[PDB]
């Protein structure tokens, strides 16, 4: 075999009768999944991976773009100078796992090293036809509803010295986040996170960062700027666009309390991640708009050199390709 690019196809368990938009997309876009697949463990084989140059990411990226553009019709879309208006009904929104598969003559190699950093050699390779079930969760700052690292926390980056590259933190223990828009301002919302789980999780990420930055102290800070999509923890819950302020999660002085409560706002006007332009959606539905999710990873940026001997990291995101990268790091397409 050998590294090669090819047209991949998706598989899932979407139900044609559900109105949920992901199920509708996958019904028309993907094929059924094999109930009993198998993977061959390769003997004495060692192959190189590079999660940062993986064409699988780009193919999934275009899939999710296609999904959102077809599912979430906005009331007004502003692209350049052309404003487009159209029907913007409220839809059912709940991501479902999607498998990415190699066609005939090709295969997908899976790195099974429990602590593979994402780039370099892997001495425990397996061959599959499809990846695992990957939920396409669009979010910034915090990676939600992903797969956890099997052993300890793992820090992933392409090059340490390039402060313009993103850092993908892969947690091993989940830190749940429960966000709600109570039934009784129709745009005010909040989330709750365990103060100890977060303070514990952050402490473990810090310890792993010292391994990569020897004689330097590690510190976290809030975002330094940008649109509201990336300066807060933004995500879509039941079709509504949530923007949750995380300044207190990464404030050193702030870390007395049991459940840290973040303030969130539902916005009808958003800056689209899938393209260039802004969109206006309809007001939020009524009732309890609740999303109990799992924080499984972090997207961090490192501040440009100061010397203070103290390295500072701030939450980031925006390029959803990295969201897909955190789940496809262990995979590569090869031609038989």
């Amino acid at each position, epitope marked *: 075999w050998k590294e090669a690019k090819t047209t991949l196809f998706c598989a899932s368990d979407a139900k044609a009768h559900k109105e949920e938009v992901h199920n509708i997309w996958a019904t028309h876009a993907c094929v059924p999944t094999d109930p009993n697949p198998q993977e061959i463990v390769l003997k004495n084989v060692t192959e190189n991976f590079n999660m940062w140059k993986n064409d699988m990411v780009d193919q999934m990226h275009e899939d999710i773009i296609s999904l959102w553009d077809q599912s979430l019709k906005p009331c007004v879309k502003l692209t*350049g100078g052309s404003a487009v208006t159209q029907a913007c009904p409220k839809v059912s929104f709940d991501p479902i796992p999607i498998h990415y598969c190699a066609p005939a003559g090709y295969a997908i190699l899976k790195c099974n090293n429990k602590t593979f950093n994402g780039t370099g050699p892997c001495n425990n390779v397996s061959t599959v036809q499809c990846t695992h079930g990957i939920k396409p969760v669009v979010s910034t700052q915090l990676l939600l509803n992903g797969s956890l690292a099997e052993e300890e926390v793992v820090i992933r980056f392409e090059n340490l010295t*390039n402060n313009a590259k993103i850092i993908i933190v892969h947690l091993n223990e989940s830190v749940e986040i429960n966000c709600t828009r109570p039934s009784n301002d129709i745009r005010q919302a909040h989330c709750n996170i365990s103060r100890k789980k977060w303070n514990t999780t952050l402490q473990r990420v810090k310890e792993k960062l010292k391994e990569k930055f020897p004689n330097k102290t590690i510190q976290f800070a809030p975002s*330094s*700027g*940008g649109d509201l999509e990336i300066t807060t923890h933004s995500f879509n819950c039941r079709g509504e666009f949530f923007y949750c302020y995380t300044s207190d999660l990464f404030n050193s002085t702030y870390m007395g309390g049991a459940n840290i409560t973040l303030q969130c706002r539902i916005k009808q006007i958003i*800056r689209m991640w899938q393209g260039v332009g802004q969109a206006m959606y309809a007001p939020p539905i009524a009732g309890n708009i609740t999303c109990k999710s799992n924080i499984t990873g972090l997207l961090l940026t490192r501040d440009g*050199g100061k010397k203070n001997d103290t390295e500072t990291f701030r939450p980031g995101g925006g390029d959803m390709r990295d969201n897909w990268r955190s789940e496809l790091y262990k995979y590569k397409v090869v031609e038989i």
Partner: antibody
Amino acid sequence: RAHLVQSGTAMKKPGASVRVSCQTSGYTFTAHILFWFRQAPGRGLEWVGWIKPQYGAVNFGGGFRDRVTLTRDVYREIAYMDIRGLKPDDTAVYYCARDRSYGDSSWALDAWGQGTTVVVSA
Amino acid sequence: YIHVTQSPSSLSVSIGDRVTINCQTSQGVGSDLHWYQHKPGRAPKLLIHHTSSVEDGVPSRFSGSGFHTSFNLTISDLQADDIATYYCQVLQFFGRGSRLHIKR
């Protein structure tokens, strides 16, 4: 094809503020990082910061985060650098320049603005 | 921090000569080293990226070489338009440059 055009010279006193603009054209604005560098007289180029025009993410070199604000207008495809608390040693030519790489960060700067002279003096 | 050193800082040359200048880095940078031309009152111009990839439109007499911590820019058949300062760069770290002038 890619072209950057900066605003004219600025004469400022200590403690004042300055806005330098960088009008782009001839390429996909949100697909290339924009960097800001400065060159004081008799010195080499010094990095100020960069901005990713997609959502406006930013980063800065030593000390500039405290005084410099980087923004952009996606519609007009123009980037802005604002500097507060101007000091005499901020006298320099400021440059905007784009990363040649599409959707990535290489730091190879293939298009430059003509430069903007900023003089800070009492 | 990456210290970037260039030598010679100043160099006299004659029209038609072959000229090569050196760039040194305090740590390994593989091949992520770029070269620029800069003249007074003008914006820098990218000549070569990633050690040896000459930029579009740059004359063929420019070439780059090196690896790890030592890199060279070479100009064959030097022309009057080539009298300028030349910077090497890795990430945010620009070298102070080598400046060419005419020997007499």
